Amino acid sequence: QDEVIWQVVGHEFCSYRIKGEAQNFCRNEYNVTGLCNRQSCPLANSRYATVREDNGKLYLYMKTIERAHFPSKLWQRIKLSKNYAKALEQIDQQLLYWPGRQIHRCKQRLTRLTQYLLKARRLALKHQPALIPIKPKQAHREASRERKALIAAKLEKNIEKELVKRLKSGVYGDQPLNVNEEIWNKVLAARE
Amino acid sequence: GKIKNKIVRQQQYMKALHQKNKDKLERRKERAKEEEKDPEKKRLRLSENIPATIESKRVYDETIIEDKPDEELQAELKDDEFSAYFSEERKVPKLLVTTSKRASRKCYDFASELLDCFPNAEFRKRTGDIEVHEIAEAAAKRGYTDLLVLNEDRKKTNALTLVHLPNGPSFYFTLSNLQTAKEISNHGRSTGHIPELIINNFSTRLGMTVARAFQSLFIQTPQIQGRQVVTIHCQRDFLFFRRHRYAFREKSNMPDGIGTGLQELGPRFTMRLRMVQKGVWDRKEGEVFFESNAGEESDRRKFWL
Amino acid sequence: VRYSASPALETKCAKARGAYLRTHFKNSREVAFTINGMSLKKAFIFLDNVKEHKQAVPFRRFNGGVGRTAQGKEFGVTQARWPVKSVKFFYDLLKNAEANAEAKGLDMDKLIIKHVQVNAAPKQAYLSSPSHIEIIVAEEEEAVPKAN
Amino acid sequence: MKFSRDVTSSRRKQRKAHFGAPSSVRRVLMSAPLSKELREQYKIRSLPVRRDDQITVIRGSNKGREGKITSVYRKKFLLLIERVTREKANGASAPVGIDASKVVITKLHLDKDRKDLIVRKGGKV
RNA sequence: AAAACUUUCAGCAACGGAUCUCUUGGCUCUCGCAUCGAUGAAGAACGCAGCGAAAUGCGAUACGUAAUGUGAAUUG
RNA sequence: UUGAGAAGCUCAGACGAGUAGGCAGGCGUGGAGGUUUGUGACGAAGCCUUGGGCGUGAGCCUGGGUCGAACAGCCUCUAGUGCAGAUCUUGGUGGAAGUAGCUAGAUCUAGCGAAACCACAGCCUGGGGAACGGGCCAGGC
RNA sequence: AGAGCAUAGCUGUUGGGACCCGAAAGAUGGUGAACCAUCUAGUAGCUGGUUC
RNA sequence: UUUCAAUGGCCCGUCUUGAAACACGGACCAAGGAGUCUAGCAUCUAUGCGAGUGUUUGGGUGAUGAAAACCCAUCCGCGAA
RNA sequence: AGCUAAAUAUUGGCGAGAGACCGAUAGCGAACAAGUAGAGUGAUCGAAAGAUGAAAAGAACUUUGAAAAGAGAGUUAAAUAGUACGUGAAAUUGCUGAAAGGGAAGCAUUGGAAAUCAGUCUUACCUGGGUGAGAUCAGUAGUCUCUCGAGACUAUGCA
């Protein structure tokens, strides 16, 4: 069984395998380490224990060889206490006389899943900027319409049109301080 | 698209294009001959066949203001959040310019150029985990009137949110086409004189709020001697920010004959309004006074500012 | 359309364009190089002089087979010709740019040829070389006293 | 899945049949759904479109519009609906073609031929 | 030595039509069928389309008539 | 002590040119079966880039720009599967060249205008054994 | 006190066009010594090239 | 990345030749472009069965593609002899 | 001297259904005016050529010009889609900018200079105390799914 299963899945084809350059990973949800190994394969290991998180609560999942052909009842689940010391002892009691490597890998996953929940709670409290996507179509539309808007704006024509307009209305004092004498003389004769 | 042969339909198109050019030329030469003989047919054609432009064919909205003064509109502006600037109190604007967390050198260059445009406006580097609402409440007790926050990421400034202390409306913009003074051809060196402000084409009611908010950042007693002008121009919902150094002189274009010689000072950028919030800026829990929808901005003839 | 130069914004520029013009590409490249950067009014006189052989267009790059002339000393060289067909095309384009500036309301006393570029049109053993010509005319940029 | 060896699943032959179809076939290719009221009153789900039919536009930019069908353009598989036009450069109104499956028939231009069609396709009146 | 000229790099504009995507086409295999002509065939020519770029269709009843069917189009 | 992809992990020493040829393991391309409860109009593929990273390498990943409808990793199957050369094939395009020259005006000017050829180059003096001078070595320019 | 048989792959080898481009043809049948079509992918110890 | 300085650095492929000398091919870029399919034979490896072994000439059968898969009557081939 | 179905053959003819095929220099010579244009006295020979967009909405109008066209505009999500029309590589050309430059370039090795990038940060742990909070805590009561007790919830208390 187990050694036949491993040869079929570990070396011919598994739909859960991600082939990386330095290591192979496992897409299985029931893998403690997340790697493709002989010891961490949930399919090839008839007795297997893992820790996974459900809506903020970490559970110990265990399966035995005697439930291998009943997929609905294959994995059993217990609640791990929020107290870390009690959670470690819960894994020790439920995994009693299991190999020390399997208890070791379950306690390692409990630490990483506890840190991730801790980091998830601290991220909620903090105020972080929301990432808003960049839309390639709207950027192209606004860049083109902006170019048309800038050309149609005629900024220099409109700036000098208003600046001369407020010179006529005398928004300054008696005579403005920004105008040369000859220009001011031309303004007075023209406007009157 | 009836013809499936590329060469044939390229020959068919060219023979139809040539015929279209020819017959339009004949009617244009005939019209010119018959309208130069009788100027009447020339002067009514020009007054009737005015070229169409996006501004002329802009969609109709009743939110636009009228030339005539209306008591209701002027009664609303006499007690709002910007009233402390336009009233007899004449409270000088004290600006606080800050950036997003962990800004880069390039954001400081834009900020330094932006601080030139605003005398009596100081910069404070954004430190740690202080938020905009906390900055606003802390800046209000320090005597500040308007808070400007420059958003930059990937070494590029792309947004600008300005809030009016203590509880005034907060406007969120998106900056584009940022261009410091060094990148502008034939630029000038800005002096310390208070620049004048000219604001154009803010016809809609929402334009008044944004125009008043932008006006409220400038000291209302401009130094005439320095003759520096800062322009905010809203064309097709695009707000163009520019600063020049004018000088009146003789030009042959205007009927009066006087024109100004603008020399750009910088910075040069464009702002697109994205959101107006009633009260201090809280992106999650703010009262949306206005929120731009990209779907209905695809209508090139419809504008909100 | 869009021209090769970052100018030709509405600000102060008037554009004139000619595509698939039936003139030699190498000759037009020399005429464009001569009148580039020169005032619009002066350019009209220079093109007028070339038509009457009073002035010669110096051929710098495609100088092969160009004889020695005494009219090129203004430009520092001695290889020059008197092209007419190429000059005629540039006269037509300059008038178009001048008319475009006048319609724009531009100040006509400060117009200079800010940018003029000649590109090779598709070739059509006698495949000649038609020319694409684009001309931008803008006012001479000026400074203003700062504060004193 | 199709099990008949008399029908082709070839995309090449399906596309050739649709785009090379004659007029008497494009009459059936240009069919439209009926409104819920007509559908449960005439006991018919869909009918080929026809001039004078009153339809409501269901999809596209013109979604929600209503009007009679002025003419059906079988060459391009398009409907031309009254008052559903687009302004041109010179101000002349160019009608916009709508696919027949993008509209719904809210009123039928009933004729004896169509009345016979209703009782033929398990309908009633 | 700066200019010009030459070289290199980059930006923009040309030139060209690669690449990508597809496709009412080809190619291959299999299956069903048996049907030209002196009662004028195959082919060729010349005509008819209100205009049709050709191409298609048709034969002085000329892009067809009669009959049947569908039932409201035709369309640049 | 958890280090059992036993096809893994681990310890130690020696060794390293290479034509013909022998052998092994890998990279990439079109299509096929399976798989990734795969990627994609919130932008697939392609192309561009003095952006960054990985590999001894074949190559691969990625940012930005452009773009607009499809596409990929893994196991296996398959083949019209990888180019700098063939006085290769087709297409495009150059230097030679505005030259050789051939239509006007007064050899000059205007207009119209090729083709052969083309690894790249271009000062000598000697020595450099195989020519070596055009590249190499010591001298002048 | 029989070790074969079948299939798949690898390699070598012999035929077929037989890694690709290469040598005057000849023959049959036509068109006006010549020209054209096919046999033909004719014949190569030799030439050039032969892709991570 | 560009550029400078110091030091070094003869044009690639083919054929020739101890070696080179050579003589060839190369203006540039893109795309295409050459050990393929098949029959027989022999070695080796894997797989199935084993004094046996080989279903597919054919027949039976196959409703969800039925040119697949599945089944095997009589021979026959090669081995045993 | 003669006739004779069936099993067999089938690059044509009338249709049909397919494919581990080719994907516009490929696949038929021909995806489109293809045995067409074109060539040759003739026999014969024989191409190149596919793609705007969802929609023509194919750019009205004003203006310069003898005209072609250009410029102001205008349509479109996009004109970095304008019939020289999807994407738009390389060779090649023009302009602009920077740098270099006594009869080559030229590449390698090491640095300088200039320009330009990756490229990062303190923020968490431990230990409190106070305050309230609630379950996997109750000297607690129910329901559901598995199998006492294991998960999911509900009510109440928060000692």
TrEMBL record, chain D:
Cited InterPro entries: KOW, Rib_uL2_dom2, Ribosomal_uL24_CS, Ribosomal_uL24_euk/arc, Ribosomal_uL24_KOW, Translation_prot_SH3-like_sf
Keyword annotations of the record: Ribonucleoprotein, Ribosomal protein
Transmembrane segments: none
Region (Disordered): 1-23
Gene Ontology molecular function: any one: structural constituent of ribosome
Assigned protein family: Belongs to the universal ribosomal protein uL24 family.
Record-given protein name: Ribosomal protein L26
Source species: Schizosaccharomyces pombe
Gene (name only): rpl26
